[PDB]
């Protein structure tokens, strides 16, 4: 259908905050021209992960109605969404980087991370590509992931639900406009989130194989 005036306001707010996304030229130049080693590659990944969290915190705080929620809840939502948001955000790097991806992919495959973890996540990046999601879709999807009622340790789940549902309605409308031909597009995006949820177990296993780590990463990931 067509977005309501309130819905239009919500999308722009999400769009403005999301498009503040940054990739320090410093991180970009490391992947392209840097010591190609398992140790060096792992370090680059950590820097990117740390950078994402800083971006993620800014996007999360700016989220409409996020400031309303309980302070414990805000941390709980932020802690809950970190792995899923990071993988989705990393997935979005088909549009953003072009040469670099081959280097980035190789560095990721040589990080010393086990092969089993690599296949599913890369499959996800390839799988996510099929959707050919717009930037607006990525922003709405990330916000929905962040604003999850289901997250552990939430004192007031219902309050989180109200914020999340408006996003879903907006995202659903976007699918029709962006992809009028496919009526199953909204369902497909939701399905990916289910595939996204898998990574927390996968991410948790990766953590267990010690390799480093940044102070910000440790708090969010509950390291030690």
């Amino acid at each position: 259908m067509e977005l309501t005036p309130d819905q239009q306001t919500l999308l722009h707010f999400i769009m403005d905050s999301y498009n503040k996304q940054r990739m320090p030229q410093e991180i970009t130049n490391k992947i392209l021209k840097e010591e190609f080693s398992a140790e060096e590659n792992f370090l680059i990944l950590t820097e990117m992960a740390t950078n994402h969290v800083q971006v993620l915190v800014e996007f999360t705080k700016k989220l409409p109605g996020f400031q309303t929620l309980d302070h414990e809840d805000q941390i709980a939502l932020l802690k809950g969404s970190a792995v899923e948001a990071m993988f989705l955000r990393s997935a979005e790097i088909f549009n953003k980087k072009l040469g670099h991806s081959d280097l980035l992919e190789e560095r990721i495959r040589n990080s010393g991370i086990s092969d089993e973890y690599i296949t599913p996540m890369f499959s996800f990046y390839k799988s996510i590509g099929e959707l050919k999601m717009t930037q607006e879709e990525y922003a709405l999807l990330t916000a929905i992931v962040i604003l999850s009622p289901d997250r552990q340790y939430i004192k007031d789940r219902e309050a989180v639900e109200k914020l999340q549902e408006p996003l879903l309605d907006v995202l659903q409308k976007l699918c029709k406009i962006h992809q009028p031909e496919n009526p199953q597009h909204f369902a497909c995006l939701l399905g990916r989130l289910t595939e996204l949820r898998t990574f927390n177990h996968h991410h948790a296993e990766m953590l267990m194989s010690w390799r480093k780590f940044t102070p910000l990463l440790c708090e969010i990931w509950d390291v030690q």
């Binding site: 800083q54 915190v57 999360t60 705080k61 302070h71 805000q74 941390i75 932020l78 802690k79 102070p215 910000l216 708090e219 969010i220």
Partner: peptide, 13 residues
């Protein structure tokens, strides 16, 4: 306290 860094970042600006 626990999660001081996250709270500080959240309460930023």
């Amino acid at each position: 306290k626990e999660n001081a860094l996250l709270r500080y970042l959240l309460d930023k600006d």
